[PDB]
Amino acid sequence: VCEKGNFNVAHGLAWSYYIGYLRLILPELQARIRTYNQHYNNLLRGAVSQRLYILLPLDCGVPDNLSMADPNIRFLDKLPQQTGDRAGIKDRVYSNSIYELLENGQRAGTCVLEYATPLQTLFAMSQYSQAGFSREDRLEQAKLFCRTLEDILADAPESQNNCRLIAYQESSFSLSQEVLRHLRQEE
Amino acid sequence: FNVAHGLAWSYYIGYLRLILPELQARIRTYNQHNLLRGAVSQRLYILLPLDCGVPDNLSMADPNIRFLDKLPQQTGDRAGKDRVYSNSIYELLENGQRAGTCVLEYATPLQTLFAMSQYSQAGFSREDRLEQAKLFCRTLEDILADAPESQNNCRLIAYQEPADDSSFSLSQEVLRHLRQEEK
Ligand SMILES: Nc1nc(=O)c2ncn([C@@H]3O[C@@H]4COP(=O)(O)O[C@H]5[C@@H](O)[C@H](n6cc(-c7ccc(-c8ccc9ccccc9c8)cc7)c7c(N)ncnc76)O[C@@H]5COP(=O)(O)O[C@@H]3[C@@H]4O)c2[nH]1
């Protein structure tokens, strides 16, 4: 019933997110985006941004369909896939989805956008009795996850201007506006 | 309580509860586009090496475990489109000849506990790793015992291989479970 427990849970999930995904995809991400831009997206104001944008809703409410969370977020395409032999599974697949961000009926941005999948584990553990966690535990673990992940990425050699965390609290809220603000701060 | 609790819950929530309900069907679609060769056990076999030593290719754990084929892929839109869930069908050799076939893999979260033991910023000792590996196994087993998505469709094999022990055949151990099952 302590924070040390809320800390250990988030610490492990943040490391898992780095070890099993970010350290493996971030190094070839900008090649994949550059490839996409050069070959399949010659739109001079429509280029896919060079960073993976990771949505960290602090209530850990993660829809599976991002486009449905905002009429102004439209699925556009997938990057070229990346495969790996992982833990005795041949060709485990790593894929990333490109979204268009609309504003005043116009395209305002294009980016690789996704929620941090591990927040779904923090939500489930808040909902399942066997896991033994309260909403207040979930909110603490979500904050500790984002902080651990930032500290990890700040020192990680695979993170070099290719990743951006978007943490926010969540009706009146536009997720596209939340991402557009971060995107527009890049260039 | 600790790191393993989140890892065990993550493995159930993000993988087992999603793939196990559909596993039985995928194995039939495989057997309909393979009976003359030998049927694949209808259960996902998950290896839990407690030393957290998890080669990405199983033949390097034991050369008698050979990749035969990949089961039909399962794709799911997850956390924002067509995330692919893939599984690998292996043959187990006895005296250079196929003794069995199953869907077989390591529990990937054990590689996290290993890499955490290796990164200074994780503050994770090798004693922490063994302790957390056992907690992972027990937490996962406790979850799967009450999980509705596990209806005789999964088998966990937890084991401690001591250092440099030629007395251990992973192939034989899996075959022992496969032979016990058919009985
Ligand atoms: N965004 C993202 N894409 C990835 O491809 C990926 N891969 C690992 N991770 C995270 O990195 C951390 C450590 O990973 P790990 O392998 O160590 O532990 C895993 C693993 O044992 C098992 N498991 C999970 C997956 C899996 C498949 C697809 C997605 C996904 C999610 C959002 C997307 C958004 C857009 C496009 C594509 C998207 C794809 C996520 C997980 C998986 C698989 N395909 N085959 C075999 N076993 C599997 O369940 C454990 C917990 O899974 P969790 O879902 O919580 O997400 C894990 C985890 O938190 C990923 N995140």
Author numbering:
A (entry chain A): 147 to 316, 321 to 337
B (entry chain B): 153 to 185, 188 to 234, 236 to 338
Show the paper's wording.
Cyclic dinucleotides (CDNs) are second messengers that activate stimulator of interferon genes (STING). The cyclic GMP–AMP synthase (cGAS)–stimulator of interferon genes (STING) pathway is an important player in detecting damage-associated (DAMPs) and pathogen-associated molecular patterns (PAMPs).1−4 Upon dsDNA detection in cytosol, cGAS synthetizes a STING ligand 2′3′-cGAMP (1a, cyclic [G(2′,5′)pA(3′,5′)p] with mixed 2′–5′ and 3′–5′ phosphodiester linkages). The binding site is formed at the interface of two STING monomers and is covered by two “lids” (residues 227–241).
Considering the results for 5k, we designed a substitution with 4-(2-naphthyl)phenyl (5l). To explain potent activities of compounds 5k–m, we solved the X-ray crystallographic structure for the complex of STING and corresponding CDNs. For 5l with a 4-(2-naphthyl)phenyl substitution, we preserved the interactions that were observed for 5k; however, naphthyl substitution clashed with Ile235 of the lid, making this residue disordered.
